[PDB]
Amino acid sequence: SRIGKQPVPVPSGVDVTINGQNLSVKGPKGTLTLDVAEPISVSRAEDGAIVVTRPDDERRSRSLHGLSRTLIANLVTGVTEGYTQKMEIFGVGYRVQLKGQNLEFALGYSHPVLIEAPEGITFAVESPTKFSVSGIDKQKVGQISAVIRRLRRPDPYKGKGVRYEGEQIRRKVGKT
Amino acid sequence: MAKADKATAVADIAEQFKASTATVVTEYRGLTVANLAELRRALGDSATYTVAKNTLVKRAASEAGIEGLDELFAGPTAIAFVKGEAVDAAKAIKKFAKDNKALVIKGGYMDGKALSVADVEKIADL
Amino acid sequence: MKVNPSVKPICDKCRVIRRHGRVMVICSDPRHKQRQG
Amino acid sequence: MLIPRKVKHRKQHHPEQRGIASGGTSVSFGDYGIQALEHAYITNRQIESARIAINRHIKRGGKVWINIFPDRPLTKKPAETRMGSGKGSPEWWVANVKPGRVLFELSYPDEKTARDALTRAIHKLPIKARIVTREE
Amino acid sequence: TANIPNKLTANVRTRTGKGASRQARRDGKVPAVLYGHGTDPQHLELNARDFAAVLRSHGTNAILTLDIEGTEQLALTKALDVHPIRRNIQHADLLVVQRGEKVTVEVTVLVEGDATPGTLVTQDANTIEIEAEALSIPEQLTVSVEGVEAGTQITAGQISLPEGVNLISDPELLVVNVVEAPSAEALEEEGA
RNA sequence: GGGGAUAAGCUCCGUGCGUCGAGAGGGAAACAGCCCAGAUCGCCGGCUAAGGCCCCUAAGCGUGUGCUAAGUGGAAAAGGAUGUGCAGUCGCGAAGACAACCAGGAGGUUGGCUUAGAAGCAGCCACCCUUGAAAGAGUGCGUAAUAGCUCACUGGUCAAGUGA
RNA sequence: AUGGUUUGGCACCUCGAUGUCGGCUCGUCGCAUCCUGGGGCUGGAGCAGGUCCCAAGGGUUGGGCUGUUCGCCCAUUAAAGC
Ligand SMILES: [Mg+2]
Ligand SMILES: [Mg+2]
Ligand SMILES: [Mg+2]
Ligand SMILES: [Mg+2]
Ligand SMILES: [Mg+2]
Ligand SMILES: [Mg+2]
Ligand SMILES: [Mg+2]
Ligand SMILES: [Mg+2]
Ligand SMILES: [Mg+2]
Ligand SMILES: [Mg+2]
Ligand SMILES: [Mg+2]
Ligand SMILES: [Mg+2]
Ligand SMILES: [Mg+2]
Ligand SMILES: [Mg+2]
Ligand SMILES: [Mg+2]
Ligand SMILES: [Mg+2]
Ligand SMILES: [Mg+2]
Ligand SMILES: [Mg+2]
Ligand SMILES: [Mg+2]
Ligand SMILES: [Mg+2]
Ligand SMILES: [Mg+2]
Ligand SMILES: [Mg+2]
Ligand SMILES: [Mg+2]
Ligand SMILES: [Mg+2]
Ligand SMILES: [Mg+2]
Ligand SMILES: [Mg+2]
Ligand SMILES: [Mg+2]
Ligand SMILES: [Mg+2]
Ligand SMILES: [Mg+2]
Ligand SMILES: [Mg+2]
Ligand SMILES: [Mg+2]
Ligand SMILES: [Zn+2]
Numbered sequence: 001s002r003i004g005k006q007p008v009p010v011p012s013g014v015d016v017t018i019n020g021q022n023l024s025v026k027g028p029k030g031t032l033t034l035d036v037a038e039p040i041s042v043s044r045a046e047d048g049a050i051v052v053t054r055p056d057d058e059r060r061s062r063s064l065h066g067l068s069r070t071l072i073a074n075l076v077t078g079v080t081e082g083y084t085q086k087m088e089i090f091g092v093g094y095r096v097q098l099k100g101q102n103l104e105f106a107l108g109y110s111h112p113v114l115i116e117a118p119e120g121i122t123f124a125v126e127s128p129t130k131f132s133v134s135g136i137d138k139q140k141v142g143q144i145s146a147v148i149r150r151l152r153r154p155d156p157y158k159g160k161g162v163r164y165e166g167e168q169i170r171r172k173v174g175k176t
Numbered sequence: 177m178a179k180a181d182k183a184t185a186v187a188d189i190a191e192q193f194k195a196s197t198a199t200v201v202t203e204y205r206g207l208t209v210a211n212l213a214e215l216r217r218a219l220g221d222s223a224t225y226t227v228a229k230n231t232l233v234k235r236a237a238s239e240a241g242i243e244g245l246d247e248l249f250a251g252p253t254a255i256a257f258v259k260g261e262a263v264d265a266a267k268a269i270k271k272f273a274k275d276n277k278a279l280v281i282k283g284g285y286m287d288g289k290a291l292s293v294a295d296v297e298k299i300a301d302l
Numbered sequence: 303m304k305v306n307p308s309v310k311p312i313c314d315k316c317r318v319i320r321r322h323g324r325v326m327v328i329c330s331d332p333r334h335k336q337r338q339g
Numbered sequence: 340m341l342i343p344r345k346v347k348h349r350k351q352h353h354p355e356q357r358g359i360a361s362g363g364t365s366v367s368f369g370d371y372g373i374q375a376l377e378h379a380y381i382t383n384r385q386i387e388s389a390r391i392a393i394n395r396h397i398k399r400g401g402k403v404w405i406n407i408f409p410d411r412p413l414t415k416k417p418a419e420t421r422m423g424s425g426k427g428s429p430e431w432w433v434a435n436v437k438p439g440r441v442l443f444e445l446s447y448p449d450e451k452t453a454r455d456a457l458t459r460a461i462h463k464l465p466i467k468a469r470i471v472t473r474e475e
Numbered sequence: 476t477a478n479i480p481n482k483l484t485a486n487v488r489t490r491t492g493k494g495a496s497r498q499a500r501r502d503g504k505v506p507a508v509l510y511g512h513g514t515d516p517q518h519l520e521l522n523a524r525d526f527a528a529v530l531r532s533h534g535t536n537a538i539l540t541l542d543i544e545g546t547e548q549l550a551l552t553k554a555l556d557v558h559p560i561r562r563n564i565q566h567a568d569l570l571v572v573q574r575g576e577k578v579t580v581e582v583t584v585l586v587e588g589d590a591t592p593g594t595l596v597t598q599d600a601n602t603i604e605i606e607a608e609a610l611s612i613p614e615q616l617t618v619s620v621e622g623v624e625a626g627t628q629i630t631a632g633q634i635s636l637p638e639g640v641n642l643i644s645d646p647e648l649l650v651v652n653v654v655e656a657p658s659a660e661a662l663e664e665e666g667a
Numbered sequence: 668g669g670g671g672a673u674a675a676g677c678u679c680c681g682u683g684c685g686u687c688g689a690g691a692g693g694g695a696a697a698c699a700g701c702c703c704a705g706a707u708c709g710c711c712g713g714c715u716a717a718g719g720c721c722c723c724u725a726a727g728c729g730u731g732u733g734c735u736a737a738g739u740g741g742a743a744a745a746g747g748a749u750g751u752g753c754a755g756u757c758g759c760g761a762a763g764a765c766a767a768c769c770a771g772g773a774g775g776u777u778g779g780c781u782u783a784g785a786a787g788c789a790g791c792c793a794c795c796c797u798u799g800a801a802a803g804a805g806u807g808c809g810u811a812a813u814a815g816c817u818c819a820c821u822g823g824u825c826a827a828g829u830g831a
Numbered sequence: 832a833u834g835g836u837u838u839g840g841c842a843c844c845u846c847g848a849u850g851u852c853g854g855c856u857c858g859u860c861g862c863a864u865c866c867u868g869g870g871g872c873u874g875g876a877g878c879a880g881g882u883c884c885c886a887a888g889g890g891u892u893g894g895g896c897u898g899u900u901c902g903c904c905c906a907u908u909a910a911a912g913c
Contacts, residue, residue: 156875157875157876157877158876172873172875173876174874174875174876175874176876
């Protein structure tokens, strides 16, 4: 709650238009629209700041103030500069490339694996086993990250399979 | 630490300041317990070194015209006292910081007025 | 996924959280993961 | 394995449990002790198990007490005998307990370890119980 | 040694008997009776919350001043009725006392110190009886133990007591006994 | 109350107990034995008990004050849990608290026994001391043992509640 | 604590009649799952396991022995469920 109590600042190269309970954010990186829970309100600070308003001090408002504030901060950050999520594959015979909007993978499966990119998200492969994902909405970025992470099962022994950047895997070795 | 502990510490720093003539505040960050140990031994000839709380020292500084360092303690603060002469500790800390690259001097007090880093370096050379 | 009616943080690191009424506890140590029920 | 070593007669009637436990309602002897809540039986086996749980963990320090003692006998007619034909034979002895009674009593330095041991005793006991200290 | 009065308001109970008593107890007020040489015993209600709080803060014994429709009386607690389960107070007794009189008080004692590996800690008695003044009622007792071995029976009358108090309890009583610690053989021998 | 296992719709007693038996009526759907209450007959009258008042079904989808999110209500325990309401407390806290985001977090010191082996981390003892600012004979996951990752306390920015 | 399935207790229904064990035919349901299906963890390198969770759609031997139910044995299957 008091997390959302702070005022979210609007960068100069940003446009925001709000009607009713719905709000929209425009910027050089695209436009995102979302509808927030009806009970909680919000006002556009004249000083280039965002102030979310909770009509009450009880469950819904206390919970949703900071929620809406953080969601708006995230979407503004995405529409201003975006997000990136690199993914590296460690293991043998793991071929990963980018052909057009789609993705072709070599994860050791006897059948080729293809992943289709949702709209509004951009990819680029930089290394044979290393690549990143550039997107505007943190929601879609994370969704795709998890989706293509789950194309391989967990690997504790060799750590083989797609993993994130800051992710580390526990070590285990069996005697016999 | 208790409120009585805070009062005792502020009183101790006040007596040390009143018994001191010049002092300097630096940043202890990035220095190993070892290097702090040998710097303390080397300065144990005339200087006395310790660590103090920003807000407590800020309040204790109101007693004298040493408010020049209030805008300067912002951030980790290390307190240095010159019991013997004045340039001893200044030169010592300057050379330790230049050798470590992990010590940054934020300022110093002398003649009752806060001076810049270059001025403090010149005084230490003095 | 140790299932049982008594769930308690094993180490000082486990977390106990709720989900659709089924209170479960989670931790980085995968072995700890236990739900209630 | 507490058991009276001799009584006037080897069997007793069913009980009345109604009434608030008056005897030993306040801790006295040590510095900590359990207090039950609800009327119930407590078997000699239960008492001995709780004693073991307390003692083996406490180990060296401190010494315990047992304010109760199972005295009244009980019986249960073996299976495969149509009810009747007189009283059965005694199987186990039990000690009664009423709300507010104190079960065990401890004098060990540390409140934390005393609490922990008595908590295991509670878990091994058949009826609810809770910690209580000497104070008024 | 001097204490501080623990002021607390009180009112004369209106109805006497189980009916009014239980009704007040449900409300949150404990029935109370005070009596003494004043040849005028009478009966009042208290506040359970403040009552228990003061009990805790001042230990088993405390000297108090009572508010009766503006009248202030000095009394010392004598007896109590603690709920067997609830941990609440049913009945307390306040005995009128004036400054400069002798009363009999039972005082608890606490134990602290360091114990040797072959030292076993045991506490036969947690309280002792002592005579003192109305304003000189203590709330705790302490004894120091360091480097005791084998049989170290500590005598109750051997303890050092502050001034103004006489040991009512006879010297034959024992306060702290330290005996040889048991081993596995003794542990298995006992209980069978 | 005895017996049974405080099980039976069990059995055996006591009740200037009650009811059915030998009792219709209303309520608990149904249900002698539980609740309300004694049917002389008739009336297309009125007042009420128990139980009820959204519809099946007659009666407030009533009044005001609070609780619950579980269809709990409309089957159940030992125990478990940052569900949620109330009250009394207490500790710390603008001398800046708790959580985060920076740095240190060691030298005797590998503390002694034990071990091939004990070095902070199989195991037993003080669990001592020193620079201090904090190092705990170290809470763990770490290595054969070392050495690293942490961590406890301590210091910096943010700026009021936070813990039991 | 649960279920009402085994050994049991009660004698409330049936002595002017409620036919009893196995086998055969036929089945039907529950799920505390035997395989097949999906998961969590492993003292899960892999294969192969162990264990717990969801799941009742379907399937779930034949013979020798004894009246046998059962059980042992032989030899199959994914299994030879309660
Ligand atoms: Mg009885
Ligand atoms: Mg009797
Ligand atoms: Mg129990
Ligand atoms: Mg009866
Ligand atoms: Mg009969
Ligand atoms: Mg009649
Ligand atoms: Mg009738
Ligand atoms: Mg009817
Ligand atoms: Mg009549
Ligand atoms: Mg009808
Ligand atoms: Mg109607
Ligand atoms: Mg109404
Ligand atoms: Mg209404
Ligand atoms: Mg209301
Ligand atoms: Mg229900
Ligand atoms: Mg329940
Ligand atoms: Mg509990
Ligand atoms: Mg540290
Ligand atoms: Mg050792
Ligand atoms: Mg040492
Ligand atoms: Mg019959
Ligand atoms: Mg019949
Ligand atoms: Mg017939
Ligand atoms: Mg016939
Ligand atoms: Mg037949
Ligand atoms: Mg038949
Ligand atoms: Mg199932
Ligand atoms: Mg499977
Ligand atoms: Mg398994
Ligand atoms: Mg199934
Ligand atoms: Mg089917
Ligand atoms: Zn854990």
